[PDB]
């Protein structure tokens, strides 16, 4: 119960929580100068609340063939790029990640960027209204068949588990220190770190969540990571296809792809 964690486990959670606070601007106050669409299952409308109370709203086009079905992608690229710079920072303030040789740092970040963005985005997802609330920005889903798309199902499922901040941050650590990404030299050290982060998560859950609604919570969490590793594969594949026809990615995204 609460103090049923080792000193080492408590310091790990604290380091990670503190990294998350220092590098995750939940209000998106510094997200600026992004592209905006000028004056299909993941279609969103976009809302912008001015400092003064006013609202701008974008409803996107219907599918009339193409050339306009991706109208919002430049903007999503700009958002994603801002997210990822926050993810890079998160990683950078973790001692265990700093100790790693630079190439592994790059390979781990290439492999987890998508997953860590999604997990961070889940914390600002409102399941009631099907809306991501990103400060003065909001992304809303249009109008139960949305649960066909694995990305949407993931957000709804993950949100239903009602995880704490500490659980989200341990999920991020576990995703970041994956030993089996394409290009990792220190595979053995990384596998050791992954497992200590997983054991701490298991303990954290044991020492804080007695109820039947959280039976099997840890394993539910690990299955979600595994599913997320698989949506990443699918989504990268789509984005590569779109990018060849209609280039939209920032320089930082291009590097990541």
């Amino acid at each position: 119960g609460v103090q049923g964690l080792t000193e080492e486990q408590r310091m790990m959670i604290r380091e990670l929580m503190d990294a998350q606070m220092k590098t995750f601007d939940t209000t998106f106050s510094h997200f600026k100068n992004f592209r905006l669409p000028g004056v299909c299952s993941l279609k969103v409308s976009l809302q912008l609340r001015g400092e003064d109370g006013s609202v701008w709203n974008y409803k996107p086009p219907a599918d009339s063939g193409g050339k306009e079905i991706f109208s919002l992608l430049p903007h999503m690229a700009d958002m994603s790029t801002y997210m990822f710079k926050g993810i890079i920072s998160f990683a950078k303030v973790i001692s265990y990640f700093r100790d790693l040789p630079i190439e592994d740092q790059i390979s781990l970040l290439k492999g987890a960027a998508f997953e860590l963005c999604q997990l961070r985005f889940n914390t600002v997802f409102n399941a009631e209204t099907g809306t991501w609330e990103c400060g003065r920005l909001s992304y809303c889903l249009e109008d139960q068949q949305l649960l066909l798309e694995p990305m949407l199902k993931f957000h709804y499922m993950l949100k239903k588990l009602q995880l704490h901040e500490e659980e989200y941050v341990l999920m991020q650590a576990i995703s970041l220190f994956s030993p089996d990404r394409p290009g990792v030299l220190q595979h053995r050290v990384v596998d050791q770190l992954q497992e200590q982060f997983a054991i701490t998560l298991k303990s954290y859950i044991e020492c804080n969540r007695p109820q039947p609604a959280h039976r099997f919570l840890f394993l539910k969490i690990m299955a979600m990571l595994t599913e997320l590793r698989s949506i990443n594969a699918q989504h990268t594949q789509r984005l590569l296809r779109i990018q060849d026809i209609h280039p939209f990615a920032t320089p930082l995204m291009q590097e990541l792809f």
Binding site: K85, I88, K92, I102, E103, I106, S107, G183, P251, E255
Partner: peptide, 15 residues
């Protein structure tokens, strides 16, 4: 050698 193909990452990592 991934540092040449990831100049921006490399930079962000050195900051």
């Amino acid at each position: 050698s991934l540092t040449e193909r990831h100049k921006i990452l490399h930079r962000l990592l050195q900051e």
